[PDB]
Amino acid sequence: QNLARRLMETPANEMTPTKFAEIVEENLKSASIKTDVFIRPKSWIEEQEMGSFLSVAKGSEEPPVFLEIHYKGSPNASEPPLVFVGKGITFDSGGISIKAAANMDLMRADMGGAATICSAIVSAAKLDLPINIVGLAPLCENMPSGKANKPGDVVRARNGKT
Amino acid sequence: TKGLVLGIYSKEKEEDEPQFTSAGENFNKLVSGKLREILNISGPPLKAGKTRTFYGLHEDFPSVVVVGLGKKTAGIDEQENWHEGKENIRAAVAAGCRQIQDLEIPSVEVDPCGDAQAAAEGAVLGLYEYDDLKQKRKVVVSAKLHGSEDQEAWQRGVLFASGQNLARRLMETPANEMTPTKFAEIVEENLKSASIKTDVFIRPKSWIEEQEMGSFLSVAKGSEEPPVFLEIHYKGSPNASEPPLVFVGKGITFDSGGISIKAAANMDLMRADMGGAATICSAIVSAAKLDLPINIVGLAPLCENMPSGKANKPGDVVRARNGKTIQVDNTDAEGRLILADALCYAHTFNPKVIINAATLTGAMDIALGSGATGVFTNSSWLWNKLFEASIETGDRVWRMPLFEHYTRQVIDCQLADVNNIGKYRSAGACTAAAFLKEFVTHPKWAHLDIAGVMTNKDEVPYLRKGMAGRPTRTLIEFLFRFSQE
Amino acid sequence: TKGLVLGIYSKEKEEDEPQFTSAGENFNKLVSGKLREILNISGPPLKAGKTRTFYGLHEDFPSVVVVGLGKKTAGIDEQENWHEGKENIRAAVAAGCRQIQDLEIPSVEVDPCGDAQAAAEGAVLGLYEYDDLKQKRKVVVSAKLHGSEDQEAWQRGVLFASGQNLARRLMETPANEMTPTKFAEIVEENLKSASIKTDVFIRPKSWIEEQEMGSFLSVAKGSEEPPVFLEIHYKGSPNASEPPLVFVGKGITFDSGGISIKAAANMDLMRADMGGAATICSAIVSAAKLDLPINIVGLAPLCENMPSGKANKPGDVVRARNGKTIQVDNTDAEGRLILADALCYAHTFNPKVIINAATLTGAMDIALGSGATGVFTNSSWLWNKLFEASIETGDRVWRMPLFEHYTRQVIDCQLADVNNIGKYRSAGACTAAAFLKEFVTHPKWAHLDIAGVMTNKDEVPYLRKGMAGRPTRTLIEFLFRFSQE
Amino acid sequence: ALYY
Amino acid sequence: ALYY
Ligand SMILES: *C(=O)[C@@H](O)[C@H](N)CCCCCCC
Ligand SMILES: *C(=O)[C@@H](O)[C@H](N)CCCCCCC
Ligand SMILES: [Cl-]
Ligand SMILES: [Cl-]
Ligand SMILES: [Zn+2]
Ligand SMILES: [Zn+2]
Ligand SMILES: [Zn+2]
Ligand SMILES: [Zn+2]
């Protein structure tokens, strides 16, 4: 839980998508060698046709990553995993639908979903739980700019829904 | 062919009629009493700041504007903390000069009104308009002293007013023209025209980075406009090693608020968010024009505050030059961020005094409006010097508190050493001053929050509507007296 | 059976260990060194305002709380404009007494800490809570001096603190209980208990009408709660004809804003909009308790400000007692309306000074928050007397400007002689003060805008959260010094 | 009075 | 800075 608190409290100019992914990677790897971590870059996100996720990330100059973590705890490698998914917005300004100033600093914790699921997986690995687990965390900022999502825009999700 | 502005006083109980100044009485003599005769016919007496125009009195002065000067002996008014006589003269002469301009007369001679410096200030401040960008303009009016006896005092008034008008120009100009680079280039040319005893460094982003000014850089980065750190030296002391006085000015060339974005209404006035830099730089230019025998350094961090995909985000933590960390909870409290780094740098000069100015808080405007600049200082000596200067100039200052009560509300901080906005709405100018004080160890420092004096509507009678360039003349007067000691 | 609060100073460079007060060192002797021994074992030294509790040291004092007093020789701090030593003592003693109360101990003896008045103030202010309406309460704690040497100073501190606590009670009580009538009855009983040299008149609506107080009546009429004009006399001078000092307090018992209605958020705090009346009335009660040899008159217009089918309507024009007309553009600027009539009435006493207090403007809270009460005065003598008193009490004041600049913004009025809200948002406390000044001809008048000091959260360490009753003690200290001259 |  |  304190790992998740650290990840959430840290200012967003330090806790970028890349930094978050690197810290979860080091914690998971310290917990167990039965682990793979892929810090998937923008090129992979594009190859995976994740148009809805890309549309959020593009307003900001901070590179997005898609964090994918595997903990291979089951004695059977082919045992289907439990999958956790966490929202990793490292800072939410609202974008073009911009938030009011008051207490907007708390939006550094808009990656709390990613923090809690990733931290739980690290702890599961520390506990040696005999299960296969996959953690997935799309990480990016939500910022206004001359390339950001515009209200009314239509984006295509990976499953083809608009 | 020229216009003429002449003063008349209010009638005293023991006088049979209101008295002209010396110049008015002499002109009346010249026209065989026709001035007094027509003034009598015209009706009620002229009260302070009021004017009346008489035509055809003399072949050389087809238009003569008489202006009411109020009580001849008006001195320091202890209820207003200024020299009332000087304020009466500035207002009346401004009013007379505006009337000459409305008649499209390009040349005016001005009665010194017993204080040629105040008269020159009224004329030069009073006529000023920023109209470079307009096709339709008023006639350009050249104002000169009437007579040849009060020339040094007249030119001193012209110099003081021109210093303030420089600040007004710098403040009024639209921000797409008055960029950090342009501001630095204009101050450079003015300072260099004033004295050869001057160095100017327009320090680029690379130098700001080398100087570890992380707090200033965090503000500038949201905008595509390059930041500069303007550093100006005026080497007026006969001893080159004499420690300088250091002035610091907030130079936000446009403040949108950043990600903590401002409302639309009247946001255009934020082109004047470099007023701190404008007034301190202009005062230094004027000090150089005056040849003051003192060493002075001016420091102005200049950048825009804009929202974008690289801007400061609420909650971000930045490292000031002195190594203190700052939690940026509100990106529109950007002036204290850039001042933190400039104030730190100020200490490297071994200064005698550090004075900063900034259009810093809306709270200052709510506190005192345009009545006076708020001064926060750890030195009552320094307060009293600024206060005394302000009495003479009429551009008033008013002391505001530096108490640990306010400090406690900014060092109470979730992530960092100091938070850039208070824990509460109350006393915003005071908690902003307390934040600045966390970057100051010097024993004679003054912070001037000039947000309330940024503009004039009609409050100062001798400034037309627009950016005010206050309190430039009070700074000049302070430097002048300091140099005499 | 009792608790005991003892002080210890911070260690000086030349001392081997931090020094107890006389009472601490004597208690340590009494317990054969066990106090010093356990304090040593307990770890780090006690800094200013910090406390630590030791049990079982003496059969008569099962709980002993040692409190950090800071630097023994802390005197007037020119950077804070107060006596720091006294502030340290009030904070530390308050903290010690709170710890005794949390242990449910009903009796405490308190180290005089080298200044028994400040100690008594810390204990009595520090323990106070308004809990009359709650089933669950803290233990009632009876605080008494430890020792018998400093009794007059101890009781003087109790009297000063009790005067402030009276104001806190009056301010905190819900407005459906603390009506104009109830407030007047409670001040009456307190003043009469203080001295027989007292007259109280709870003047009804009929008297207010006879006195042509149209501005005050216009505020009161929106509410069904009857208005009263409280007039209190304390005849302390040996000469009955000696002109009195006159205090005036805004007594709005609840401010909804009226037709210019306030937002919901935290509107409950407007039960304290009679804080001006509370503090001036309480100060007069305390002056009477002190037997001060001066004549004093207290005046408090009391009513509610409510919206209804008979309330003040924006634009209405009302006639003040002095015959000036007022355009009521904003019905939530009601304090200046009621003060206009009370200030006029104040002049009928031939006073030596007129001091008014009012929770008058939100702008005052934005200007200085709870750091200091804003004082607007036409007399620097009077400013300096209030400022000097404030240094001693620690309940700070800060001067704010009375300039014609602000007057011009309230006499610029479409329908009437003066407008009850400025032409602009800027400098709201200053234009409110300028409006009041239009009802004052007296040469020694001070207006105290106490809106920013109405409440405490944690800023004043010796006041629990709630209505603050500031600056009652500064007023008492002012009266005490004036009476000695 | 409020502002404004 | 705004308030607030
Ligand atoms: C103007 O609205 C006055 O009538 C109000 N009594 C001012 C209240 C300001 C409260 C600020 C501190 C919480
Ligand atoms: C805080 O927002 C500062 O960064 C702004 N420059 C203050 C501007 C206040 C203007 C008030 C007078 C119009
Ligand atoms: Cl700021
Ligand atoms: Cl009011
Ligand atoms: Zn700003
Ligand atoms: Zn700004
Ligand atoms: Zn009100
Ligand atoms: Zn009110």
PDB file of N, CA, C and O in Angstrom, chain B residues 352-376:
ATOM      1  N   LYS B 352      23.895  46.372  -1.115  1.00  0.00           N
ATOM      2  CA  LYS B 352      23.616  47.186   0.062  1.00  0.00           C
ATOM      3  C   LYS B 352      22.134  47.060   0.447  1.00  0.00           C
ATOM      4  O   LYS B 352      21.788  47.124   1.628  1.00  0.00           O
ATOM      5  N   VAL B 353      21.290  46.998  -0.585  1.00  0.00           N
ATOM      6  CA  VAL B 353      19.831  46.833  -0.459  1.00  0.00           C
ATOM      7  C   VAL B 353      19.373  45.941  -1.605  1.00  0.00           C
ATOM      8  O   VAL B 353      20.016  45.900  -2.676  1.00  0.00           O
ATOM      9  N   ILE B 354      18.267  45.228  -1.387  1.00  0.00           N
ATOM     10  CA  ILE B 354      17.629  44.502  -2.473  1.00  0.00           C
ATOM     11  C   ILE B 354      16.214  45.004  -2.509  1.00  0.00           C
ATOM     12  O   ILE B 354      15.529  44.913  -1.513  1.00  0.00           O
ATOM     13  N   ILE B 355      15.774  45.556  -3.649  1.00  0.00           N
ATOM     14  CA  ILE B 355      14.363  46.011  -3.753  1.00  0.00           C
ATOM     15  C   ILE B 355      13.753  45.243  -4.933  1.00  0.00           C
ATOM     16  O   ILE B 355      14.284  45.296  -6.031  1.00  0.00           O
ATOM     17  N   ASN B 356      12.665  44.494  -4.726  1.00  0.00           N
ATOM     18  CA  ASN B 356      12.009  43.889  -5.907  1.00  0.00           C
ATOM     19  C   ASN B 356      10.633  44.531  -6.120  1.00  0.00           C
ATOM     20  O   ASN B 356      10.058  45.048  -5.183  1.00  0.00           O
ATOM     21  N   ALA B 357      10.134  44.484  -7.363  1.00  0.00           N
ATOM     22  CA  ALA B 357       8.787  44.974  -7.676  1.00  0.00           C
ATOM     23  C   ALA B 357       8.106  43.943  -8.540  1.00  0.00           C
ATOM     24  O   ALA B 357       8.727  43.313  -9.403  1.00  0.00           O
ATOM     25  N   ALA B 358       6.791  43.786  -8.337  1.00  0.00           N
ATOM     26  CA  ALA B 358       6.061  42.791  -9.096  1.00  0.00           C
ATOM     27  C   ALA B 358       4.564  43.108  -9.080  1.00  0.00           C
ATOM     28  O   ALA B 358       4.013  43.541  -8.054  1.00  0.00           O
ATOM     29  N   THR B 359       3.910  42.870 -10.226  1.00  0.00           N
ATOM     30  CA  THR B 359       2.428  42.941 -10.315  1.00  0.00           C
ATOM     31  C   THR B 359       1.913  41.586  -9.756  1.00  0.00           C
ATOM     32  O   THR B 359       1.506  40.710 -10.506  1.00  0.00           O
ATOM     33  N   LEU B 360       2.032  41.379  -8.443  1.00  0.00           N
ATOM     34  CA  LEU B 360       2.144  39.997  -7.956  1.00  0.00           C
ATOM     35  C   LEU B 360       0.797  39.333  -7.642  1.00  0.00           C
ATOM     36  O   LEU B 360       0.656  38.138  -7.839  1.00  0.00           O
ATOM     37  N   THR B 361      -0.130  40.087  -7.037  1.00  0.00           N
ATOM     38  CA  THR B 361      -1.325  39.425  -6.553  1.00  0.00           C
ATOM     39  C   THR B 361      -2.574  40.212  -6.812  1.00  0.00           C
ATOM     40  O   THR B 361      -2.569  41.431  -6.684  1.00  0.00           O
ATOM     41  N   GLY B 362      -3.674  39.512  -7.112  1.00  0.00           N
ATOM     42  CA  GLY B 362      -4.975  40.166  -7.152  1.00  0.00           C
ATOM     43  C   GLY B 362      -5.329  40.677  -5.775  1.00  0.00           C
ATOM     44  O   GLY B 362      -6.025  41.715  -5.654  1.00  0.00           O
ATOM     45  N   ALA B 363      -4.833  39.994  -4.755  1.00  0.00           N
ATOM     46  CA  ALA B 363      -5.165  40.373  -3.367  1.00  0.00           C
ATOM     47  C   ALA B 363      -4.672  41.792  -3.046  1.00  0.00           C
ATOM     48  O   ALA B 363      -5.318  42.549  -2.303  1.00  0.00           O
ATOM     49  N   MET B 364      -3.538  42.188  -3.633  1.00  0.00           N
ATOM     50  CA  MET B 364      -3.049  43.547  -3.402  1.00  0.00           C
ATOM     51  C   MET B 364      -4.009  44.612  -3.938  1.00  0.00           C
ATOM     52  O   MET B 364      -4.217  45.667  -3.295  1.00  0.00           O
ATOM     53  N   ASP B 365      -4.611  44.330  -5.105  1.00  0.00           N
ATOM     54  CA  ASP B 365      -5.591  45.246  -5.657  1.00  0.00           C
ATOM     55  C   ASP B 365      -6.841  45.300  -4.763  1.00  0.00           C
ATOM     56  O   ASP B 365      -7.383  46.368  -4.476  1.00  0.00           O
ATOM     57  N   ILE B 366      -7.248  44.150  -4.256  1.00  0.00           N
ATOM     58  CA  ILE B 366      -8.377  44.147  -3.312  1.00  0.00           C
ATOM     59  C   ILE B 366      -8.032  44.881  -2.026  1.00  0.00           C
ATOM     60  O   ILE B 366      -8.887  45.553  -1.481  1.00  0.00           O
ATOM     61  N   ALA B 367      -6.774  44.783  -1.567  1.00  0.00           N
ATOM     62  CA  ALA B 367      -6.348  45.450  -0.339  1.00  0.00           C
ATOM     63  C   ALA B 367      -6.303  46.970  -0.454  1.00  0.00           C
ATOM     64  O   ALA B 367      -6.910  47.686   0.337  1.00  0.00           O
ATOM     65  N   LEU B 368      -5.553  47.499  -1.420  1.00  0.00           N
ATOM     66  CA  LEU B 368      -5.368  48.981  -1.469  1.00  0.00           C
ATOM     67  C   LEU B 368      -5.653  49.589  -2.857  1.00  0.00           C
ATOM     68  O   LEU B 368      -5.596  50.814  -2.993  1.00  0.00           O
ATOM     69  N   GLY B 369      -6.003  48.769  -3.854  1.00  0.00           N
ATOM     70  CA  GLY B 369      -6.397  49.372  -5.156  1.00  0.00           C
ATOM     71  C   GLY B 369      -5.220  50.188  -5.693  1.00  0.00           C
ATOM     72  O   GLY B 369      -4.059  49.811  -5.541  1.00  0.00           O
ATOM     73  N   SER B 370      -5.525  51.317  -6.315  1.00  0.00           N
ATOM     74  CA  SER B 370      -4.488  52.112  -6.944  1.00  0.00           C
ATOM     75  C   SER B 370      -4.095  53.265  -6.033  1.00  0.00           C
ATOM     76  O   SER B 370      -3.404  54.207  -6.457  1.00  0.00           O
ATOM     77  N   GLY B 371      -4.496  53.199  -4.763  1.00  0.00           N
ATOM     78  CA  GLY B 371      -4.165  54.319  -3.864  1.00  0.00           C
ATOM     79  C   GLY B 371      -2.678  54.353  -3.548  1.00  0.00           C
ATOM     80  O   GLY B 371      -2.095  55.441  -3.390  1.00  0.00           O
ATOM     81  N   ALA B 372      -2.050  53.166  -3.423  1.00  0.00           N
ATOM     82  CA  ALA B 372      -0.657  53.104  -3.056  1.00  0.00           C
ATOM     83  C   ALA B 372      -0.082  51.739  -3.366  1.00  0.00           C
ATOM     84  O   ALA B 372      -0.796  50.740  -3.362  1.00  0.00           O
ATOM     85  N   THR B 373       1.210  51.699  -3.667  1.00  0.00           N
ATOM     86  CA  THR B 373       1.948  50.441  -3.837  1.00  0.00           C
ATOM     87  C   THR B 373       2.167  49.813  -2.436  1.00  0.00           C
ATOM     88  O   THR B 373       2.506  50.511  -1.457  1.00  0.00           O
ATOM     89  N   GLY B 374       1.922  48.515  -2.332  1.00  0.00           N
ATOM     90  CA  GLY B 374       2.144  47.812  -1.036  1.00  0.00           C
ATOM     91  C   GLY B 374       3.620  47.468  -0.875  1.00  0.00           C
ATOM     92  O   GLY B 374       4.216  46.875  -1.788  1.00  0.00           O
ATOM     93  N   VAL B 375       4.230  47.857   0.254  1.00  0.00           N
ATOM     94  CA  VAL B 375       5.626  47.589   0.519  1.00  0.00           C
ATOM     95  C   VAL B 375       5.811  46.670   1.737  1.00  0.00           C
ATOM     96  O   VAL B 375       5.407  47.020   2.870  1.00  0.00           O
ATOM     97  N   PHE B 376       6.427  45.526   1.472  1.00  0.00           N
ATOM     98  CA  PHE B 376       6.764  44.563   2.511  1.00  0.00           C
ATOM     99  C   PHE B 376       8.280  44.640   2.680  1.00  0.00           C
ATOM    100  O   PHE B 376       9.022  44.390   1.719  1.00  0.00           O
TER     101      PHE B 376
END
